[PDB]
Design a protein around this ligand. Structure first.
Ligand SMILES: C=CCN1CC(=O)N(C)c2ccc(C(=O)C3=C(O)CCCC3=O)c(C)c2C1=O
Ligand SMILES: C=CCN1CC(=O)N(C)c2ccc(C(=O)C3=C(O)CCCC3=O)c(C)c2C1=O
Ligand SMILES: [Co+2]
Ligand SMILES: [Co+2]
Lengths: 380, 380
């Protein structure tokens, strides 16, 4: 069931913003690890005396990395005279965020028809305001409300490249890396209590619940066309194996973004390319399932994947799960930074063709049981 | 003249420690950019609930990257029960350092015969104590005094791998990168006033001045065998071209480490390898000199480098300077992080064979004039 209850017109995920201590080093690491090209910048070289922001792109996926400069560089500015390109930025907020949580996502940004109306309707329906609508160069409107923890949901709307005040990156600095990643499929939050978090977010967005003891309960909120997908997890306590959600909440100092799932147009190429780079600056992957897991894929998805395609999943450590409508290929990185908090998921979905409908195949919750079963089976 | 006036027995540069917001991302970026292998770790996986520290090595060069965890993880600890592997570490100090200065060097570490005696003699001769001598696992002693700004000079001495409590890195995570870098040649500080900084450091070390308007005055302090080399720069004001030392001091919020010069055993291979990676996660280099600079190298070093070797310098943008005793090949990166503060120099020295004596060929001060001359000549 999809009641299509969005309280304002939502388009697609627009970008994800990381708050960093040093944006340059995080962005360069991510660029090489994920195959994303440097596309835009806002920093001292573009007249921004407040923050350094670097944009990476792969297809429609946009990762923004932002860090504060010394406040002394902008001490004479006021908000009417700011040189910041992102008007919601605040030195103290950014330093406090990073000290509390470490490297992680500050903003989940969605493009909407009218960011001012989205903000007004959201706050009228219970959203906690974070940054009011600001019109940039009479061209783009940006507004922010609290999502969970210190993560904001950022609304962006365009009258008619990223944001005014950003400059396209010099091509010599813009190597055309591409490992096949094409868009953000979903963005997942960890919270102490799922119920109140769902009520709050669904309350101000009108997002509906998307149709679905390893230590979590989860639910998924979705926009009208189910292209914006926001799962939320809570821990399940006293499970004998400590909940990874609870570990997250401890090391993160509370609620925050758990993972970003990045859709690939060719998950086999993406994983070949990422795994080649894991130990030379890129990202590591979680330990692969035992071969019994792939010996059990024939009965589960033998009508979707050939033996060769299943063997290629086994070579790359890719997990497979299935809906009543489609099939999901997925794999998970180790944490992106020092803390056992945020990580990345690479996914590709097969089925649900009409274009492909959002969430085809689900989110892989079936792989909690199937991976445990494979592990005990391989114990043999 | 070398009075050999060291007040305690100094051996060699031991390591350089960067204080970071996220040690993982900086270390992975540096590993790929410089060709350094992951050699040791101290972090949650080794029982350290205080800080994440990752060691990169290339030859004898040791780069350590450290970031603080949430203080909550270690809130019940006291110094007698600490799980930190580096006892001088302090969450507040590290966060304050990084907020003030951004990514940069906290510790210049030299190996000495006896870190306790080096500390005592240093403080008796005016050194400002930073961290008292602490014996780690009855095997290694570490102590710290202030060098300049918030940079410390760290003394390390060994009774008889890096530090107790560090673990050798799993080989799968230890890709054997190597672009030819072999050791730290010198470490350079920027200060507002050169005179008082030289008097202070030479005062407590016994280091002697090493025998030598672009906006700086500098002098070099050296140990008895001139293998530990610590240049210090001050700005020259009112120069019509703003002093890069003054720009540093502004963006860094005061004195700090300006550059690390890394000796390569094959500077041509090192630069080929680093430049291949500049736009795919590595380091960028300063804009190369005009061809008139290389058209003028024949008269300057035509008896040291062949035409082909000069042409190879031109291909890679390498600078050349000359002493009365030897010749220096050098090149400079763009700043390592967001702020126009710290950068890296790659160098190789030719001549002064006895082993090669320290500082052979100087520090390239001749290239201020010669690069400007080449630029006006190429204006033509
Ligand atoms: C990274 C290591 C832990 N891990 C271990 C593991 O074995 N399996 C099988 C999964 C399977 C699916 C998902 C997942 O993507 C997801 C949910 O967990 C809840 C619904 C929404 C959502 O998107 C995750 C995060 C993990 C997982 O995290
Ligand atoms: C990075 C861009 C600025 N730049 C521009 C430039 O054109 N030249 C020619 C040099 C030449 C030598 C050195 C240098 O290594 C050094 C001293 O400056 C003082 C004595 C001790 C020392 O080691 C530096 C840092 C630079 C330099 O920084
Ligand atoms: Co997921
Ligand atoms: Co130098």
């Amino acid at each position: 069931k999809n009641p299509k209850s969005d309280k304002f017109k939502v388009k697609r995920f627009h970008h994800i913003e990381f708050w960093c201590g040093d944006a340059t080093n995080v962005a360069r690491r991510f660029s090489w690890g994920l195959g994303m090209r440097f596309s835009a910048k806002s920093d001292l070289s573009t007249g921004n005396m407040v923050h350094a922001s670097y944009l990476l792109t792969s297809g429609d996926l946009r990762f923004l990395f932002t860090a504060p400069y010394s406040p002394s560089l902008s001490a004479g500015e006021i908000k009417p005279t700011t040189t910041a390109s992102i008007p919601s930025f605040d030195h103290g907020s950014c330093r406090s965020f990073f000290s509390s949580h470490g490297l992680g996502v500050r903003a989940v940004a969605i493009e909407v028809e009218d960011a001012e109306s989205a903000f007004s309707i959201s706050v009228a329906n219970g959203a906690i305001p974070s940054s009011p609508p600001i019109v940039l160069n009479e061209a783009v409107t940006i507004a922010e409300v609290k999502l969970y923890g210190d993560v904001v949901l950022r609304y962006v709307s365009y009258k008619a490249e990223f944001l005014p005040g950003f400059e396209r990156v010099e091509d010599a600095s813009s190597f055309p890396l591409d490992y096949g990643i094409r868009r953000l499929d979903h963005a997942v939050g960890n919270v102490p209590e799922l119920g109140p978090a769902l009520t709050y977010v669904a309350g101000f967005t009108g997002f509906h619940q998307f149709a679905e003891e390893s230590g979590l309960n989860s639910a998924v909120l979705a926009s009208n066309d189910e292209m914006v997908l926001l799962p939320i997890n809570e821990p399940v306590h006293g499970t004998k194996r400590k909940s990874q959600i609870q570990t997250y909440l401890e090391h993160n100092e509370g609620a925050g973004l758990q993972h970003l799932a990045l859709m690939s147009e060719d998950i086999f190429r993406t994983l070949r390319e990422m795994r080649k780079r894991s130990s030379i600056g890129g990202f590591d992957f979680m330990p692969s399932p035992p071969p019994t897991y792939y010996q059990n894929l024939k009965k589960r998805v033998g009508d979707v994947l050939s033996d060769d395609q299943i063997k290629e999943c086994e070579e790359l450590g890719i997990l497979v799960d299935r809906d009543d409508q489609g099939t999901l290929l997925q794999i998970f990185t180790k944490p992106l930074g020092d803390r056992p908090t945020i990580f990345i998921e690479i996914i590709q979905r097969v089925g649900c063709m009409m274009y492909q409908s959002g969430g085809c195949g689900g989110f892989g919750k079936g792989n909690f049981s199937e991976l445990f079963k494979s592990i005990e089976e391989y114990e043999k």
